[PDB]
Design a protein around this ligand. Structure first.
Ligand SMILES: Nc1ccn([C@@H]2O[C@H](COP(=O)(O)OP(=O)(O)OP(=O)(O)O)[C@@H](O)[C@H]2O)c(=O)n1
Lengths: 47, 65, 125
RNA sequence: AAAGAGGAGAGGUA
């Protein structure tokens, strides 16, 4: 649920990178943080 | 209210994680909720503004401390 | 069979509804009564065998229609529904009333898109 | 107190 810091992805972000990020978040933090992360990404993309 | 659904989601996730079977913990929560509802219905009035299942989740998560 | 599983129904203003089990039961009863009456008065034994054959065919049609010979046809050229047609196929008892059901406390409506919602939330009219 | 019973055709929407 903690103790892992995200890496700075200095590149272009397509669908594959988003799927990789979602998998990493689920594997490292749990099933409750992933929903909020997906919601934030959806809001940013819509904006 | 000060209690949002996000806290309940985290508490439920914590309850699921710290156990060996999800079906067993679901049955335990259901039993506790039924007992709490029966206790409420026959005595006093209590803080009725919370459903029995949410109450059972709250007490069971607090017992983990 | 009990009479409440084959209802008569009182629509049509002056007439009555059609049920298929009742017709087959009536035919069986009619043939049985005719055969008994013929046997009582010592009829010649070339007419009795005819009645026996028709009784056998009537019972066969009641049990399973069209399995052996010709099929019994109602008013229009449409075969009747026997006892074996109630439990047989996709519209039979097993696959229609036992493995699936209609339920209470249910609704249905069109869906639109709601942004600004949370992933565990929905909007109900 | 009461209130719809089934069946058969034809045409549509995910
Ligand atoms: N015989 C059919 C026809 C349609 N469907 C359902 O309806 C959908 C059809 O969706 P539709 O909107 O007609 O087409 P799409 O493939 O979604 O394409 P688009 O919306 O871009 O036109 C199918 O995927 C399926 O879920 C079905 O189950 N059986």
């Amino acid at each position: 649920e903690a103790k892992s810091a995200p890496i700075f992805r200095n590149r272009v972000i397509d669908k594959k990178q988003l799927k990789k990020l979602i998998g990493w978040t689920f594997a490292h933090y749990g099933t409750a943080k992933t929903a909020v992360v997906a919601d934030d990404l959806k809001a940013l993309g819509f904006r | 209210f000060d209690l949002d659904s996000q806290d309940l989601l985290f508490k439920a996730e914590s309850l699921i994680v710290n156990s060996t079977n999800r079906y067993h913990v679901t049955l335990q929560i259901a039993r506790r909720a039924k007992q709490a509802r029966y206790e409420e219905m026959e005595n006093l009035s209590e803080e009725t503004g919370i459903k029995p299942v949410l109450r059972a989740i709250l007490e069971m998560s607090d017992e983990l401390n | 069979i009990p009479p409440d599983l084959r209802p008569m129904v009182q629509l049509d203003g002056g007439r009555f509804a059609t049920s298929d089990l009742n017709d087959l039961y009536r035919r069986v009863i009619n043939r049985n009564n005719r055969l008994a009456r013929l046997q009582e008065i010592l009829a010649p034994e070339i007419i009795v065998r005819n009645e026996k054959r028709m009784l056998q065919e009537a019972v066969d049609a009641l049990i399973d229609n069209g399995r052996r010979g010709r099929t019994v046809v109602g008013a229009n050229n449409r075969p009747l529904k026997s006892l074996s047609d109630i439990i047989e196929g996709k519209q039979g008892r097993f696959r229609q009333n036992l493995l699936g059901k209609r339920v209470d406390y249910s609704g249905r409506s069109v869906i639109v898109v709601g942004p600004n919602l949370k992933i565990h939330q929905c909007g109900l009219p």
